[PDB]
Swiss-Prot record, chain C:
It comes from Plasmodium falciparum (isolate 3D7). The keyword Plastid does not apply. This is Large ribosomal subunit protein eL43. Keywords: Cytoplasm, Metal-binding, Ribonucleoprotein, Ribosomal protein, Zinc, Zinc-finger. NCBIfam families: eL43_euk_arch. A zinc finger (C4-type) spans 38-59. It is found in: Cytoplasm. The keyword Ribosomal protein applies. It holds the Pfam family Ribosomal_L37ae. It comes from the Eukaryota.
Length: 61, 106, 85, 247, 43, 72
RNA sequence: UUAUCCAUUUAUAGGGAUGAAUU
RNA sequence: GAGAACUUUGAAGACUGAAGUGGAGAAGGGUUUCUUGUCAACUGUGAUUGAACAAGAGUUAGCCGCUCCUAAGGGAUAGCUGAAAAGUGUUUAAAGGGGUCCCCGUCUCAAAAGGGAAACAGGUUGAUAUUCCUGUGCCAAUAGUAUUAUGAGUUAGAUGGUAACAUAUAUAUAAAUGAACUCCUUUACAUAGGCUUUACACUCGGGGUGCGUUUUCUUUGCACUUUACCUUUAUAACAAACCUUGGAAUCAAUUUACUUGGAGAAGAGGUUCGUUGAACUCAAUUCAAAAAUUUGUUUUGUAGCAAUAGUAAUUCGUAAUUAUCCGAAGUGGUAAGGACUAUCCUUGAAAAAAGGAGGGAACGGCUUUGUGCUUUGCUACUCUUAAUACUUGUAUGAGCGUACCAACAACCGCAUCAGGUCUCCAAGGUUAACAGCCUCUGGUUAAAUAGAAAAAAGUAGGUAAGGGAAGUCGGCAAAAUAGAUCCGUAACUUCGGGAAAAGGAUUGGCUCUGAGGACAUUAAUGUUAACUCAGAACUGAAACGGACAAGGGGAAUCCGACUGUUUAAUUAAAACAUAGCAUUGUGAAAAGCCACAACUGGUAUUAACACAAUGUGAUUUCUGCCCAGUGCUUUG
RNA sequence: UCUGAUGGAGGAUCGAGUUGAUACUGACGUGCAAAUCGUUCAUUUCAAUCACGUUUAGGGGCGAAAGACUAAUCGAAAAG
């Protein structure tokens, strides 16, 4: 199973013939949205804190 | 994996029988009954939680020290500070209005 | 985008029950789930809690109102006659 | 035959009211000298839901006068009452929404709820959600007052009987179509074992005068006389008329 | 069950005590016997 | 079990009439670290010692009425 | 209105001009 | 052993497969438990076995439960009915407690899953363990007097903070006066959804130790590497709430979601609770700058419990010595908590018990006038925790349960019966998955029998050329794909659906390519993590959801709108229910409907937007004529 | 008015478990069984399911109604 996991890490057993659950069951779209949103919000907070963006510009973005 | 079993005669997961697995120094995984979480004491008027007071179940509250059952002010333990402030102003101002209503009479 | 042409909030009922029944329940669930104007605080934040009880999320103060709207026209007119005197 | 479903109701075994979570009987204040000769104000502290009924109930706190302390009363809330309001009850209470007054002290044309059909029975008429009675006449001699009840009947009540000014809240409830049998189930789960019904015409003759036959019909006139015995009063009881109304 | 009342436990003990055979010395000068699986106490 | 840190309070607890025993534990760490634990009616009080010298004067300086229990 | 019957209560003040409040 | 297919041991081949013949319980059983015997019968074959028979033994609690509280409710009291038997249970009741006159008040039972004083680990037996032993704790109780001692307070009740609020660390944060009378809080509560934190679980890599493989390969595969309650555990961190300052439109802060603000936002500084429970230099400690005690740098300690225990090893008389028990992470399985949002013609117990407050009744000590009150000379004086001594009747910890089964032969089915029977724990691989299939720990290799042969016939299945429903009452039965991704999807329609319509394509392995984050430095360069998608080459007997798992679709008619329910053991439906619709009675304790022998009761903790009695049966569109008959009903 | 996300409603869908019982009119029908076994099938957020407690008792109860059920007994239980 460790060898199989190394191969999967190289991306070796995940073709569309190896998938049994739906796209969302395999990778929740809600979780993907949440991760992206947290990433972008964190970046905006960093910029506004470091004063690289005005407060209004931060709010608009 | 080590599997556990109830130890406290209640073999149903009622709200008073929630459990928590711990690892013992003997290397085995046992189960401990957790105490029910107690609600916060609440203000007599606004019903919000009173701060400065612990939130213990009655048995634990009876054993708690007097310091963290009360708040050293006026009502302080039954009325929140905002409600107390409003009550002070209301008590003083309404008697003042009663007196001015008296003095206006003649 | 626009998710339903006309069914609105009644889309939760699918195809069940008649279209007239769904339309009638829409016309009053619209006002049951609305936010009304709290005259005590001036913020439009009073929502229905139970069938006749309406609570403002800001003042925390609650009033007795209609089953589906904060006020009912019958009681509105009734109060107005009293206030006239 | 056997005892029919209507007859089994009075035994009160499984047909007692489901009243486990009821908050208390809705009665207004017992008559006091303060109410009789002046006014007494109590403040409404909460507006709560009584599971059996649709009308909200106001918890009105009065200050006791025969001794130091407070007394809590469960009133049927009229529409417009709010927590923190001061309600005034008595002969000299002003005419405003929420106040309890003798019906002889109100001008003709006002709308009232919580009507005492006899003075002092602390509230017996006009209590379902959205209802209201109208004071339509006052006797010249006083001591009598004529009101229109929500059924439309005109009733004469002595002018010392009390009522709330206003309309009992939660009005318009009937307007919502109960969409489904489940909503009906939940509605009656907190009132009574009166639901589902089952038609007598779908029964067997042993258990209902409508039961039996090869075609599911009544077979005899469904208008039964007022004198019919308990197992017989099953159709349209003492119907003066029948069929769609025309006015 | 493991949970018992005092009287019930004493009755169980009495039944166990009576389920014993006739003493050998007596027999040289019993029908009312039961097995836990065949005939139940019902008491 | 309680842990006491200053020497003054530990000595005071030792001098109490209630205390019954002192437990001396010594063990290697990497230097021998020790700990002295007074057995009173309510609690067992412990003090740890990195300092061999302090630890070696204190148990002696303690008065010998109460009984020694050496675990190592 | 005294028999009889009903209602309410803690049988708790004789008739007319959203603070507490008890010793 | 007289005797062994079914007793025991070792070896092998397999099974159960954490949804278990695995561990714990309840109901029920009642000694079936354990040890030693042991075989007349039973253990549907054998039997040396056994849940059989025989003799002995075995169940240890202040902390686990009952016991207490109250619930649905039961019994009883007062009455009142009744020949009584019985029925009802405040309906003319003078119906224990509190303080010191007044105030409160039917009794009792009903939960081994609700509420609830307090326990953990290690070890131990043939059989019991949160019960025994060892160690460490915790809860409740603890009378009067007197001595001490611990602390506060006082020349009659302390003090800090602007505030949120904080403060008693004595062995032990015990004491911060407080009556009547009050007012609150806790106990104390639904469902759905996601987000989040923590513990446990699982997993990855490093180090050590042991074992295994070793024709060949393999810095390798496996195992251990642990840490309880308690210490208001101290702190640290965080979701919230609140306080101070502040003063917001170019509105801003902010969540996955929306949430919030001149009724005071952002920013800055704080307070508290709740989560957790050694986090954080946490504690003590080494070294330097602040001054008549703070800020940085180090040592120690698994923070105490605690290593003394446990585990895995190496040895030595045969009971002891020894060494290890520590470095970094990932997935999201379970549980709990948090802050939220949403839903209801549904709003989701009570009491015992505990706490907080408002109020301000009473008031030092020695002695003395006179009649508890003014009085005289003097001041070191009250509460709180602990111990001791004496008096108090003997001045700690009641009683009961505790073995075993829980079905697989301990229960109920007449039985050692393929049936039935409530709860908790819950590993790895593949996978959407607690599915199926295989596996580790644990368990098993047992089933009212075995051996041989192996035809008919039966039963439970497979496969069949060509045809493809010609069979048959009828496609009964079987077959046909069936996962996922991409594409495509009609009539009709209540505009929501129909829909997985229909119908196409692809799918393995291998080698790569691209995309999606976190962490620091003086616009610039390094360290490091998930599996998730997309694309391309190559490769093969063109095969790839390879096993497992897994819709047949379409055109129409009838019926019932739908979800739902039903003739337990021949009918599951078109029957019943239903929402919707309509009609009828009733304004009340001299009412409607209904119960009762009476008394009294149910609806009713009710009041026409209600209750009761019927019919029809979603929606859409309609619901015609007849009051002669029979009913019902209205006036005189 | 339109498009993309977000969101997570519904007596929504599939589906194990649970709860049942459509068909084979399969097996069995001197059964394992006085209702079982196999495959197939219905059902799983709600009028859902389960436990214990509790209430309703025989010309009575209880019935989403089949004269169903009321201890293998029901168009009037069982015992004497």
């Amino acid at each position: 199973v460790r060898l199989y996991k190394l191969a999967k890490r190289k991306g070796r057993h995940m073709g569309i013939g190896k998938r049994k659950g739906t796209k969302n069951a395999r990778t929740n779209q809600k979780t993907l949205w949440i991760k992206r949103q947290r990433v972008l919000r964190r970046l905006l907070k960093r910029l506004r804190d470091s004063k690289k963006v005005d407060r209004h510009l931060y709010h608009s973005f | 994996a080590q599997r556990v079993h109830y130890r406290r005669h209640n073999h149903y997961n009622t709200k008073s029988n929630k459990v928590r697995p711990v690892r013992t120094p003997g290397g085995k995984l046992t189960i401990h009954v957790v105490k029910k979480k107690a609600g916060k004491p609440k203000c007599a008027d606004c019903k919000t939680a009173i701060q400065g007071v612990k939130a213990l179940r009655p048995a634990d509250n009876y054993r708690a020290r007097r310091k963290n059952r009360t708040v050293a002010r006026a009502y302080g333990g039954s009325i929140c500070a905002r409600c107390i402030r409003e009550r002070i102003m209301r008590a003083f101002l309404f008697e003042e209005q009663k007196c001015v209503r008296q003095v206006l009479k003649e | 985008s626009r998710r339903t042409k006309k069914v609105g909030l009644t889309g939760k009922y699918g195809t069940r029950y008649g279209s007239s029944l769904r339309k009638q329940i829409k016309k009053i669930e619209l006002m049951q789930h609305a936010k009304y104007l709290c005259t005590f605080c001036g913020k439009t934040a009073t929502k229905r809690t139970c069938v006749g009880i309406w609570k403002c999320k800001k003042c925390k103060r609650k009033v007795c109102g209609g089953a589906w709207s904060l006020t009912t026209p019958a009681a509105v007119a009734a109060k107005s006659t009293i206030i006239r005197l | 035959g056997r005892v029919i479903r209507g007859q089994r109701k009075g035994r009160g075994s499984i047909f007692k009211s489901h009243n486990h979570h009821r908050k208390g009987a809705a009665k207004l204040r017992h008559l006091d000298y303060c109410e009789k000769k002046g006014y007494i104000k109590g403040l409404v502290k909460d507006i709560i839901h009584d599971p059996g009924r649709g009308a909200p109930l106001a918890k009105v706190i009065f200050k006791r006068t025969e001794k130091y302390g407070k007394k809590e009363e469960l009133i049927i809330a009229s529409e417009g009452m709010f927590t923190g309001q001061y309600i005034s009850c008595g002969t000299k209470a002003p005419l405003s929404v929420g106040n309890i007054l003798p019906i002889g002290k109100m001008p003709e044309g006002t709308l009232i709820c919580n009507l005492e059909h006899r003075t002092g029975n602390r509230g017996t008429l006009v209590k379902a959600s959205g209802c209201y009675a109208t004071v339509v006449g006052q006797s010249e001699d006083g001591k009598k007052t004529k009101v229109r009840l929500p059924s439309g009947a005109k009733k004469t009540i002595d002018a010392k009987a009390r009522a709330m000014v206003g309309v009992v809240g939660a009005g318009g409830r009937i307007d919502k179509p109960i969409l489904k049998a489940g909503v009906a189930h939940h509605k009656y789960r907190v009132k009574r074992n009166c639901w589902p019904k089952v038609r007598g015409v779908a029964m067997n003759p042993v258990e209902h005068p409508h039961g039996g036959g090869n075609h599911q019909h009544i077979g005899h006139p469904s208008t039964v006389s007022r004198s019919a015995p308990a197992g017989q009063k099953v159709g349209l009881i003492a119907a003066r008329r029948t069929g769609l109304l025309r006015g | 069950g493991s949970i018992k009342r005092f009287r019930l436990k004493q009755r169980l003990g009495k039944c166990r005590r009576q389920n014993r055979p006739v003493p050998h010395w007596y027999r040289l000068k019993n029908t009312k016997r039961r097995h836990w699986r065949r005939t139940k106490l019902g008491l | 079990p309680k842990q006491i840190t200053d020497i003054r309070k530990f000595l005071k607890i030792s001098r109490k009439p209630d205390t019954t025993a002192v437990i001396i534990m010594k063990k290697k760490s990497k230097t021998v670290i020790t700990k002295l634990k007074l057995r009173t009616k309510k609690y067992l009080y412990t003090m740890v010692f990195a300092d061999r010298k302090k630890a070696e004067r204190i148990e002696n300086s303690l008065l010998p009425s109460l009984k020694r229990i050496y675990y190592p």
